[PDB]
Amino acid sequence: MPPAIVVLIGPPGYVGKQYPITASDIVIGRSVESQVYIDDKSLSRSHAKFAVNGSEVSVIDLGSTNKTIVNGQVIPPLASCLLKNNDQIKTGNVIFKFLEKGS
């Protein structure tokens, strides 16, 4: 399977949902235009996005109100983080787990 993110912590409609990360330009946000749409008021309308190049998947912060945090480190606006298996990504009151192979 391609890589994915899983909702570890979130609202009841969303906890445990998995989203495949197959290509660049996938956006996490509360705007309905987002590919990873979560209805949580603490998530920015456009919060973060992914870049994919072969086996490398990175997350990019888009100037979010409540920040993008990977394993306890803040990713400042327009900066990025190369992900690895089991990393946690906190976006407001939502926390995702990154899986190098999705279930």
Numbering used by the authors: 32 to 134
Quoted passage from the original study:
B. bacteriovorus is an obligate bacterial predator of other Gram-negative bacteria, exploiting adaptations that allow consumption from inside the prey cell periplasm. The DgcB protein appends the C-terminal GGDEF enzymatic domain with an N-terminal forkhead-associated (FHA) domain, known to be used (in other proteins) for interactions with phosphopeptide ligands. DgcB comprised a ~30aa tail, 100aa FHA, 20aa linker and 160aa GGDEF domain. We provide the molecular basis for initiation of c-di-GMP production, demonstrating that the stimulus is a phosphopeptide tail present on the DgcB GGDEF synthase itself.
By combining a tailless DgcB FHA construct (residues 32–131, V32 replaced with an initiating methionine) and synthetic phosphopeptide (N7SDNLEKpTSIVASDT17) in-trans, we were able to obtain complex crystals diffracting to 1.48 Å resolution. The asymmetric unit of this new form contained two FHA domains that were in an offset dimer identical to both the full-length and FHA-only structures, providing a third independent observation of this interaction. The exposed FHA cleft of chain B displays clear density for a bound phosphopeptide, allowing unequivocal modeling of residues 11–21. The conformation of the bound tail region does not differ substantially from that of the unphosphorylated complex (rmsd 1.0 Å for all atoms), but sits relatively deeper into the FHA cleft, making more extensive contacts. The more deeply situated tail is now able to form mainchain hydrogen bonds with R61, K72 and N97 (via both groups of the amide sidechain). The FHA surface creates two depressions which accommodate the two “inwardly projected” residues of the tail (pT14 and +3 V17); the flanking L11 and T21 sidechains sandwich opposing sides of the central FHA body. The central pT14 of the peptide tail is recognized by a multitude of interactions, the sidechain methyl group projecting into a pocket formed by residues 72–75 and 96–97, which positions the phosphate toward the positively charged R61 and R76. The phosphoryl group is tightly co-ordinated by the FHA cleft of DgcB: OG by R61, O1 by S95 and T96, O2 by both the backbone NH and sidechain of R76, and O3 by R76 (and the backbone NH of pT14 also). Comparison of the peptide-bound and unbound FHA domain structures reveals that peptide binding does not induce any obvious gross conformational change or long-range signaling motions, merely alterations in the rotameric states of R61, K72 and R76. Our structure of the FHA:phosphopeptide complex demonstrates that cleft occupancy does not alter the FHA:FHA contacts, at least for a peptide added in trans.
